[PDB]
Amino acid sequence: DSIFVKLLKISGIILKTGESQNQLAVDQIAFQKKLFQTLRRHPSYPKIIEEFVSGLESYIEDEDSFRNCLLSCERLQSYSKSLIKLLLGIDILQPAIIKTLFEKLPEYFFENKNSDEINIPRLIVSQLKWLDRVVDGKDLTTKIMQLISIAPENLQHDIITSLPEILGDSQHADVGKELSDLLIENTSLTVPILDVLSSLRLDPNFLLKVRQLVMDKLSSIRLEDLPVIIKFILHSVTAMDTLEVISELREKLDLQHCVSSGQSCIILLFDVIKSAIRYEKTISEAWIKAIENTASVSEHKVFDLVMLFIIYSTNTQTKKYIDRVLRNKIRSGCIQEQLLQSTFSVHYLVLKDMCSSILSLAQSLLHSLDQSIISFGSLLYKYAFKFFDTYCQQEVVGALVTHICSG
Amino acid sequence: LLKAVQPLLKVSMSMRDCLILVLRKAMFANQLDARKSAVAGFLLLLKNFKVLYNSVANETFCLEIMDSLRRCLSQQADVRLMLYEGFYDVLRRNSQLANSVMQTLLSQLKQFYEPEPDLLPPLKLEACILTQGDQISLQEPLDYLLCCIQHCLAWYKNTVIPEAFYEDLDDILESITNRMIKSELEDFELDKSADFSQSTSIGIKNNISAFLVMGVCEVLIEYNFSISSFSKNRFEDILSLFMCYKKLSDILNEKAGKAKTKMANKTSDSLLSMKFVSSLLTALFRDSIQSHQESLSVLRSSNEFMRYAVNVALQKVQQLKETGHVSGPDGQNPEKIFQNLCDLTRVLLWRYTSIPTSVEESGKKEKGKSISLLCLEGLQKIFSAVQQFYQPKIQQFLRALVSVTQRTAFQIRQFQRSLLNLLSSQEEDFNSKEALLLVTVLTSLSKLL
């Protein structure tokens, strides 16, 4: 009936009632360009957009019709993107659409998961994701940050986790500042900010500021939050603050106050460490040399050796620097059994995967002289065989009989 | 990696849809290599995925990709650049897209184009710059863009036709060229209103704008030359363009004469294809055709121009010695490069041999940068670069100009007698350098005998 639904029908899309996923009679870009060019060739090209938006907003006043305008379109030639996203790529309707889209949503902050357990705020933010074009960022920037400021904890948290695909290089840095105003506002809300900010283009100076605003609040935290925090920290460092921050961190931590969410989130911490150690050698070599330089004090702890094993497994190339560091380390009356005991007593699930890493170390130890070497390499086998799988045990004995027949 | 892989992704749909998924997760990432590898992957899809399995399964899909690339175009400069560089390759491999592809860049230009004549600074140059927190940066390399446009469009007219975008673009570039002739650096606010202070945000901006300007001019030079069957008004226009270009270059020499010589950004590579340069020297030195000659007598006059348009071939071959590749179109199809190196060698031999240094009429200042000398310098660098890279095609090299050796000896003797004449002539101020690199040439040549 209306210019809205009629030009939908013309452009190759069917508008259904509000019970089922809408259809489309042509390809997506065919429909989009037919709509665009048809409005352009239609006279009063500026003011037909007003009739379009008025017809649409008058149509989506029903909850289910609104939801079906938002739901995926049904393809014949068999699913595609929704109607509303196929209008959101259209740059000329774009600002008015974004305005009205942000406008009515505060009717729904209590009418959440209405019919089929669908977060309509999550539906309406999920309209704005992987936008292949943005026409005005700063109007959206003002709107998004104020609409986050009004929103509840869980919903705005979900919105926070979905921003950086939406945002452009026009509007990263400024929102970096406003997010620190949100960072300070709540202790409940500190971590998904770090997720976002880690995933953004921001200057290293504000990044270093917020890095210190994290690092002062390291030991004042639960475990749940630390891998996503630490991931951010692992890609917050410079090339020059590497030794200082590794030392700062390593001396500051507990890993033991937290000690079945504990071992699970420590595995995720270590996965974050595995993702950052792999290529950023400016941090991995920084770490190796940050601990070899703290070989003086024999009070260096589980984390120092866990990292030795992980990094020895990780980098094929930096194996022998680790090898030589440990052969000097062991000799000083440093690394001893009791560390290895608790290491394999609690931090076993991480090294459970790194069986052959341990075994290679052991094999490389038992070859040489200095019975301290040989003693420690044997203790390694013992505890490694003890706490690990039957596959690990099978592997161990294989390796042992090999050292026997061979060496 | 993906050059290797993709023949898998002809077959698989799951891996294809996981790759493209990762490419569209990467363009919105913080680390820089995400954006660029995302573009790279995209273009390679766009390349080999079809020529135009069902074609209806691919066209829509590649269009979807290019709708995605309109995002990257909203991102930092080099990500735009990489597109602009790749698109000629795309079209040579995948013609059917042209009607779309042009528009993608046309609209990209239209944020800068000012289509009202009697407006002199005919582009928006404060759209190609970004200032925030007193950090001042380039965005939208317009120069490379125009280069892309020119190349694609010429190729279009060449092969595609044997439809309104390009019939417009003709008159677009025409109006741009005319406006460019009579914009005299105070529509750009240059040289006196600013002093290219690398300290000040404004002098920085000036530096950048100027580089862009010169690049623009270079492309327009290529276009004006390409259009005509050697019509004289366009050649006068080329000379005036070049006169403004050189004016800018010597402004920077004034500005680069004061500070220490770590501004090696002045030698920013030209936006002229190897191809066009080959064709240009071919037409300067081995053209006696009266029907064209009235125009060429205009360029042949302006020596500065003639030495610009050699220094280029030097920058191109020097790119070929430092890297395996050059910047332009067909800048990695090595046979194209081997063609263009042969067709430089040919002309420079013609020039150097026929016309030695002792016919000079310039004097002491240009005697430190005389032209025949630079023809020879390029010859030294070519011979060096070939023996390095195109070893097996050396018999092919020379039939241009029987074994390897007779060809080699006949080439040698020209330099040999040249240097002998050089020594026998004088002892007062004999051209040290000429001798030095004649010897160097012979050195290179030796290593085939």
CSV table of C-alpha atoms in Angstrom, one decimal, chain B residues 65-425:
chain,number,residue,atom,x,y,z
B,65,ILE,CA,33.9,-8.7,-2.1
B,66,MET,CA,34.3,-5.3,-3.8
B,67,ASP,CA,31.4,-3.9,-1.7
B,68,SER,CA,33.6,-5.1,1.2
B,69,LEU,CA,36.7,-3.3,-0.2
B,70,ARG,CA,34.8,0.0,-0.1
B,71,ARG,CA,35.4,-0.4,3.7
B,72,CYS,CA,39.3,-0.6,3.3
B,73,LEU,CA,39.1,2.4,1.1
B,74,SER,CA,37.8,4.3,4.3
B,75,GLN,CA,41.1,3.0,6.1
B,76,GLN,CA,44.8,4.2,6.1
B,77,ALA,CA,46.7,5.2,3.0
B,78,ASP,CA,48.8,2.2,2.0
B,79,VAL,CA,45.7,0.0,2.1
B,80,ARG,CA,44.2,2.2,-0.5
B,81,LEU,CA,47.5,2.2,-2.4
B,82,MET,CA,47.7,-1.6,-2.6
B,83,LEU,CA,44.3,-1.6,-4.2
B,84,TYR,CA,45.2,1.1,-6.7
B,85,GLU,CA,48.4,-0.9,-7.6
B,86,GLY,CA,46.5,-4.2,-8.1
B,87,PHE,CA,43.5,-3.2,-10.0
B,88,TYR,CA,45.2,-3.0,-13.5
B,89,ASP,CA,46.2,-6.7,-12.9
B,90,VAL,CA,42.6,-7.5,-11.9
B,91,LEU,CA,41.2,-6.0,-15.2
B,92,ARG,CA,43.8,-7.6,-17.4
B,93,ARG,CA,42.8,-11.0,-15.8
B,94,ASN,CA,39.0,-10.3,-15.2
B,95,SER,CA,37.7,-7.8,-17.9
B,96,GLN,CA,33.9,-8.3,-17.2
B,97,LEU,CA,34.0,-6.0,-14.1
B,98,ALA,CA,35.1,-2.7,-15.8
B,99,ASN,CA,31.7,-1.0,-15.7
B,100,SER,CA,31.7,-1.4,-11.9
B,101,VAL,CA,35.4,-1.1,-11.1
B,102,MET,CA,35.9,2.4,-12.6
B,103,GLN,CA,32.9,3.7,-10.6
B,104,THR,CA,34.5,2.4,-7.3
B,105,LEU,CA,37.4,4.8,-8.0
B,106,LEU,CA,35.4,7.4,-9.9
B,107,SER,CA,33.3,8.0,-6.7
B,108,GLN,CA,36.6,7.8,-4.7
B,109,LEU,CA,37.9,10.7,-6.8
B,110,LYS,CA,34.6,12.6,-6.6
B,111,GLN,CA,35.2,13.5,-2.9
B,112,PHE,CA,38.1,15.6,-4.4
B,113,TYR,CA,36.9,16.6,-7.9
B,114,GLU,CA,35.3,20.2,-8.2
B,115,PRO,CA,33.4,20.0,-11.6
B,116,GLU,CA,32.9,23.9,-11.9
B,117,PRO,CA,35.3,25.6,-14.3
B,118,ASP,CA,36.7,29.0,-13.3
B,119,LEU,CA,37.8,27.3,-10.1
B,120,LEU,CA,41.6,27.1,-10.3
B,121,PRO,CA,42.8,24.6,-7.6
B,122,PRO,CA,40.7,22.0,-9.3
B,123,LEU,CA,40.9,19.2,-6.6
B,124,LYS,CA,40.4,19.0,-2.8
B,125,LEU,CA,43.9,18.6,-1.2
B,126,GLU,CA,42.8,19.0,2.5
B,127,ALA,CA,40.6,15.9,2.0
B,128,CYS,CA,43.9,13.9,1.3
B,129,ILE,CA,45.4,15.0,4.7
B,130,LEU,CA,44.4,14.2,8.3
B,131,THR,CA,45.4,16.3,11.4
B,132,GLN,CA,44.6,15.3,15.0
B,133,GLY,CA,46.6,15.9,18.3
B,134,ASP,CA,49.2,17.7,16.0
B,135,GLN,CA,49.8,14.3,14.3
B,136,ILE,CA,49.6,15.1,10.5
B,137,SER,CA,49.3,12.2,8.0
B,138,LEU,CA,48.4,11.4,4.4
B,139,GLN,CA,45.2,9.6,3.5
B,140,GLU,CA,44.1,8.9,-0.1
B,141,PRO,CA,47.1,8.8,-2.3
B,142,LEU,CA,45.4,10.6,-5.2
B,143,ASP,CA,48.5,10.3,-7.5
B,144,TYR,CA,48.6,6.5,-7.5
B,145,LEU,CA,44.8,6.6,-7.9
B,146,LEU,CA,45.0,8.7,-11.1
B,147,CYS,CA,47.8,6.4,-12.3
B,148,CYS,CA,45.4,3.4,-11.8
B,149,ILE,CA,42.7,5.3,-13.6
B,150,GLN,CA,44.9,6.3,-16.6
B,151,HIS,CA,46.2,2.7,-17.0
B,152,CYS,CA,42.9,0.9,-16.7
B,153,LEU,CA,41.2,3.4,-19.0
B,154,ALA,CA,43.8,3.3,-21.8
B,155,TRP,CA,43.7,-0.5,-21.6
B,156,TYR,CA,39.8,-0.3,-21.8
B,157,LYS,CA,39.9,1.9,-25.0
B,158,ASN,CA,42.6,-0.4,-26.4
B,159,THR,CA,41.1,-3.9,-26.0
B,160,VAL,CA,37.7,-3.8,-24.3
B,161,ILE,CA,35.6,-1.9,-27.0
B,162,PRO,CA,37.0,-4.1,-29.8
B,163,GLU,CA,29.7,3.0,-21.3
B,164,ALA,CA,29.1,6.6,-20.0
B,165,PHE,CA,31.7,6.6,-17.2
B,166,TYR,CA,34.8,6.7,-19.6
B,167,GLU,CA,33.1,9.0,-22.2
B,168,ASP,CA,32.7,11.4,-19.2
B,169,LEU,CA,36.3,10.7,-17.8
B,170,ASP,CA,37.8,11.9,-21.1
B,171,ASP,CA,36.3,15.4,-20.6
B,172,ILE,CA,37.0,15.0,-16.8
B,173,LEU,CA,40.8,14.6,-17.3
B,174,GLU,CA,40.7,17.3,-20.1
B,175,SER,CA,39.1,19.9,-17.8
B,176,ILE,CA,41.5,18.8,-15.0
B,177,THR,CA,44.5,19.2,-17.3
B,178,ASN,CA,43.5,22.7,-18.4
B,179,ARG,CA,42.8,23.8,-14.8
B,180,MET,CA,46.2,22.2,-13.9
B,181,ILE,CA,48.0,24.3,-16.5
B,182,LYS,CA,46.9,27.6,-15.1
B,183,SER,CA,46.9,26.8,-11.3
B,184,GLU,CA,50.2,28.6,-10.3
B,185,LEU,CA,51.0,27.4,-6.7
B,186,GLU,CA,49.0,30.2,-4.9
B,187,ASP,CA,45.7,28.3,-5.5
B,188,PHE,CA,47.7,25.6,-3.7
B,189,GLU,CA,49.2,28.3,-1.3
B,190,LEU,CA,52.9,27.3,-1.8
B,191,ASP,CA,56.5,28.6,-1.8
B,192,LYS,CA,56.0,32.0,-0.2
B,193,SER,CA,52.8,31.6,2.1
B,194,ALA,CA,54.7,28.4,3.3
B,195,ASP,CA,58.4,27.4,3.4
B,196,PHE,CA,58.1,23.5,3.6
B,197,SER,CA,59.3,23.6,7.3
B,198,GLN,CA,59.6,19.8,8.2
B,199,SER,CA,59.2,21.1,11.8
B,200,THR,CA,55.9,23.0,11.4
B,201,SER,CA,52.6,21.0,10.8
B,202,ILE,CA,52.0,23.4,7.9
B,203,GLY,CA,55.4,23.0,6.1
B,204,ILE,CA,55.0,19.2,6.6
B,205,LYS,CA,51.6,19.4,4.9
B,206,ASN,CA,53.2,21.6,2.1
B,207,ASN,CA,55.9,18.9,1.6
B,208,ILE,CA,53.2,16.2,1.3
B,209,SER,CA,50.8,18.2,-0.9
B,210,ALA,CA,53.7,19.1,-3.2
B,211,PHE,CA,54.7,15.4,-3.7
B,212,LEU,CA,51.1,14.6,-4.5
B,213,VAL,CA,51.0,17.5,-7.0
B,214,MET,CA,54.1,16.4,-8.8
B,215,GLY,CA,52.7,12.8,-9.0
B,216,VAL,CA,49.4,14.1,-10.4
B,217,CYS,CA,51.3,16.2,-13.0
B,218,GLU,CA,53.4,13.1,-14.0
B,219,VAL,CA,50.3,11.0,-14.7
B,220,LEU,CA,48.7,13.8,-16.7
B,221,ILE,CA,52.0,14.0,-18.7
B,222,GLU,CA,51.5,10.3,-19.6
B,223,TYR,CA,47.8,10.9,-20.5
B,224,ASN,CA,48.4,14.0,-22.7
B,225,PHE,CA,51.1,12.0,-24.6
B,226,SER,CA,48.9,8.9,-24.9
B,227,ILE,CA,45.8,10.7,-26.3
B,228,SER,CA,47.1,12.4,-29.5
B,229,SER,CA,48.7,11.3,-32.7
B,230,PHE,CA,51.3,13.9,-31.7
B,231,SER,CA,49.2,17.1,-31.7
B,232,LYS,CA,51.2,20.2,-30.5
B,233,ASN,CA,48.9,22.0,-28.0
B,234,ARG,CA,48.9,18.9,-25.6
B,235,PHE,CA,52.7,18.8,-25.9
B,236,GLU,CA,53.0,22.6,-25.0
B,237,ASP,CA,50.6,21.6,-22.0
B,238,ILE,CA,53.0,18.8,-21.1
B,239,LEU,CA,56.0,21.2,-21.2
B,240,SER,CA,54.1,23.7,-18.9
B,241,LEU,CA,53.0,20.9,-16.5
B,242,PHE,CA,56.7,19.7,-16.4
B,243,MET,CA,57.8,23.4,-15.9
B,244,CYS,CA,55.6,23.6,-12.8
B,245,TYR,CA,56.8,20.1,-11.7
B,246,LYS,CA,60.5,21.1,-12.0
B,247,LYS,CA,59.6,24.4,-10.3
B,248,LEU,CA,58.4,22.4,-7.4
B,249,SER,CA,61.4,20.0,-7.5
B,250,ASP,CA,63.9,23.0,-7.4
B,251,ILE,CA,61.8,24.7,-4.7
B,252,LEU,CA,62.5,21.5,-2.7
B,253,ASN,CA,66.2,21.8,-3.7
B,254,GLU,CA,66.2,25.3,-2.1
B,255,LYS,CA,64.4,23.7,0.9
B,256,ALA,CA,66.7,20.5,0.8
B,257,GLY,CA,69.9,22.6,0.3
B,258,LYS,CA,69.7,24.0,4.0
B,259,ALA,CA,69.0,20.9,6.2
B,260,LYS,CA,71.2,17.8,6.3
B,261,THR,CA,70.7,15.3,3.3
B,262,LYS,CA,68.5,12.7,5.1
B,263,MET,CA,65.4,13.9,3.1
B,264,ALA,CA,66.0,11.1,0.5
B,265,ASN,CA,62.1,11.2,0.0
B,266,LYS,CA,62.5,13.7,-2.9
B,267,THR,CA,63.5,10.7,-5.2
B,268,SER,CA,60.0,9.2,-4.5
B,269,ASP,CA,59.5,6.9,-7.5
B,270,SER,CA,57.8,8.3,-10.6
B,271,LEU,CA,54.3,7.2,-11.6
B,272,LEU,CA,55.3,6.6,-15.2
B,273,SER,CA,55.3,2.9,-16.4
B,274,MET,CA,58.5,1.4,-17.6
B,275,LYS,CA,56.5,1.0,-20.9
B,276,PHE,CA,55.7,4.7,-21.5
B,277,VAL,CA,59.4,5.7,-20.8
B,278,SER,CA,60.7,3.1,-23.4
B,279,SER,CA,58.1,4.5,-25.9
B,280,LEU,CA,59.0,8.1,-25.0
B,281,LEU,CA,62.8,7.7,-25.7
B,282,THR,CA,62.0,5.6,-28.8
B,283,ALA,CA,60.0,8.6,-30.0
B,284,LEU,CA,62.6,11.3,-29.0
B,285,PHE,CA,65.8,9.9,-30.5
B,286,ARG,CA,64.7,7.5,-33.3
B,287,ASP,CA,61.8,9.5,-34.8
B,288,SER,CA,62.6,11.4,-38.0
B,289,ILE,CA,58.9,11.3,-39.2
B,290,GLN,CA,58.0,14.9,-40.3
B,291,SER,CA,54.2,14.3,-39.6
B,292,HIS,CA,55.1,14.0,-35.8
B,293,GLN,CA,58.5,15.9,-35.9
B,294,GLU,CA,57.0,19.4,-35.5
B,295,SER,CA,55.8,18.4,-31.9
B,296,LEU,CA,59.0,16.4,-31.0
B,297,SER,CA,61.2,19.5,-31.9
B,298,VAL,CA,59.3,21.2,-29.0
B,299,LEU,CA,60.4,18.5,-26.4
B,300,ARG,CA,63.8,18.0,-28.0
B,301,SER,CA,64.3,21.8,-27.3
B,302,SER,CA,63.7,21.6,-23.5
B,303,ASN,CA,66.9,19.7,-22.4
B,304,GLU,CA,65.9,19.7,-18.7
B,305,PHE,CA,62.8,17.6,-19.8
B,306,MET,CA,65.0,15.4,-21.9
B,307,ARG,CA,67.2,14.6,-18.8
B,308,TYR,CA,64.1,14.2,-16.4
B,309,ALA,CA,62.9,11.5,-18.9
B,310,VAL,CA,66.2,9.7,-18.6
B,311,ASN,CA,66.8,9.9,-14.8
B,312,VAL,CA,63.5,8.0,-14.8
B,313,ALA,CA,64.9,5.0,-16.7
B,314,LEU,CA,67.7,5.2,-14.2
B,315,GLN,CA,65.3,5.1,-11.2
B,316,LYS,CA,63.5,2.1,-12.9
B,317,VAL,CA,66.5,0.0,-13.6
B,318,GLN,CA,67.9,0.9,-10.1
B,319,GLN,CA,64.6,-0.4,-8.7
B,320,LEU,CA,65.3,-3.6,-10.7
B,321,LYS,CA,68.7,-4.0,-9.1
B,322,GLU,CA,67.6,-3.4,-5.5
B,323,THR,CA,64.4,-5.4,-5.8
B,324,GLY,CA,63.3,-8.1,-8.3
B,325,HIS,CA,60.3,-5.9,-9.3
B,326,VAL,CA,59.4,-2.3,-10.3
B,327,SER,CA,56.3,-0.2,-9.4
B,328,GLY,CA,54.1,0.1,-12.5
B,329,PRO,CA,51.9,-2.0,-14.7
B,330,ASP,CA,53.3,-5.3,-15.8
B,331,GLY,CA,56.0,-4.6,-13.1
B,332,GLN,CA,56.5,-8.3,-12.4
B,333,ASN,CA,55.8,-10.0,-15.8
B,334,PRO,CA,59.6,-10.3,-16.3
B,335,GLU,CA,59.4,-10.8,-20.2
B,336,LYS,CA,57.7,-7.3,-20.3
B,337,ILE,CA,60.6,-6.0,-18.3
B,338,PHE,CA,63.1,-7.8,-20.5
B,339,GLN,CA,61.3,-6.2,-23.5
B,340,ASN,CA,61.5,-2.7,-22.0
B,341,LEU,CA,65.1,-3.1,-21.0
B,342,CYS,CA,66.1,-4.2,-24.6
B,343,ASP,CA,64.1,-1.3,-26.0
B,344,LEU,CA,66.0,1.2,-23.6
B,345,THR,CA,69.3,-0.4,-24.4
B,346,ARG,CA,68.5,0.0,-28.1
B,347,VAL,CA,67.8,3.8,-28.0
B,348,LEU,CA,70.7,4.6,-25.6
B,349,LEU,CA,73.2,2.9,-27.8
B,350,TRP,CA,71.8,4.9,-30.7
B,351,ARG,CA,72.2,8.2,-28.8
B,352,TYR,CA,75.6,7.5,-27.1
B,353,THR,CA,77.2,6.0,-30.2
B,354,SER,CA,75.9,8.6,-32.9
B,355,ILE,CA,76.5,11.6,-30.6
B,356,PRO,CA,79.5,11.6,-28.1
B,357,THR,CA,80.2,14.1,-25.3
B,358,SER,CA,82.7,16.3,-27.3
B,359,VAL,CA,79.8,17.8,-29.3
B,360,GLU,CA,78.4,19.3,-26.0
B,361,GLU,CA,77.3,23.1,-26.1
B,362,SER,CA,76.0,23.4,-22.4
B,363,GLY,CA,79.2,24.2,-20.4
B,364,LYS,CA,80.7,23.4,-16.9
B,365,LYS,CA,77.4,23.3,-14.8
B,366,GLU,CA,75.6,20.8,-17.1
B,367,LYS,CA,79.0,19.0,-17.9
B,368,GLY,CA,78.7,17.4,-14.4
B,369,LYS,CA,75.2,16.0,-15.5
B,370,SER,CA,75.5,16.0,-19.3
B,371,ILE,CA,73.0,13.7,-21.0
B,372,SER,CA,75.1,11.2,-23.1
B,373,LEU,CA,76.9,10.4,-19.8
B,374,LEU,CA,73.6,9.4,-18.2
B,375,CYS,CA,72.7,7.3,-21.3
B,376,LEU,CA,75.9,5.5,-20.5
B,377,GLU,CA,75.3,5.3,-16.8
B,378,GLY,CA,72.0,3.5,-17.5
B,379,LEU,CA,73.7,1.2,-19.9
B,380,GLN,CA,76.2,0.2,-17.1
B,381,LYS,CA,73.2,-0.5,-14.7
B,382,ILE,CA,71.2,-2.4,-17.3
B,383,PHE,CA,74.2,-4.6,-18.2
B,384,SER,CA,74.8,-5.2,-14.5
B,385,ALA,CA,71.1,-5.8,-13.8
B,386,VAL,CA,70.6,-8.3,-16.7
B,387,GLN,CA,73.7,-10.4,-15.9
B,388,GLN,CA,72.3,-10.6,-12.3
B,389,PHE,CA,68.6,-11.5,-13.2
B,390,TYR,CA,67.9,-12.5,-16.9
B,391,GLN,CA,70.9,-14.7,-17.5
B,392,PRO,CA,69.5,-17.3,-19.9
B,393,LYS,CA,67.9,-14.7,-22.3
B,394,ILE,CA,71.3,-13.0,-23.3
B,395,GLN,CA,71.3,-14.3,-26.9
B,396,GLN,CA,67.6,-12.9,-27.0
B,397,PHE,CA,69.0,-9.6,-25.5
B,398,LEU,CA,71.4,-8.9,-28.3
B,399,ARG,CA,69.5,-9.9,-31.6
B,400,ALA,CA,67.9,-6.5,-30.7
B,401,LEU,CA,71.1,-4.7,-31.9
B,402,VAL,CA,76.3,-16.0,-34.9
B,403,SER,CA,77.2,-16.7,-31.2
B,404,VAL,CA,77.2,-14.6,-27.9
B,405,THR,CA,80.7,-13.4,-28.7
B,406,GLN,CA,80.7,-11.5,-32.1
B,407,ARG,CA,77.7,-9.4,-30.9
B,408,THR,CA,79.6,-8.8,-27.6
B,409,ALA,CA,82.9,-7.8,-29.3
B,410,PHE,CA,81.1,-5.4,-31.8
B,411,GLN,CA,79.4,-3.7,-28.8
B,412,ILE,CA,82.7,-3.6,-26.9
B,413,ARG,CA,84.8,-2.0,-29.6
B,414,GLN,CA,82.5,1.1,-29.6
B,415,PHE,CA,83.3,1.8,-25.9
B,416,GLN,CA,86.9,0.8,-26.5
B,417,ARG,CA,87.6,3.3,-29.4
B,418,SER,CA,85.5,5.9,-27.4
B,419,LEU,CA,87.8,5.7,-24.4
B,420,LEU,CA,90.9,5.6,-26.6
B,421,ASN,CA,89.7,8.8,-28.3
B,422,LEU,CA,89.0,10.1,-24.7
B,423,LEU,CA,92.6,9.5,-23.6
B,424,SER,CA,94.4,10.5,-26.8
B,425,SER,CA,92.3,13.8,-26.8
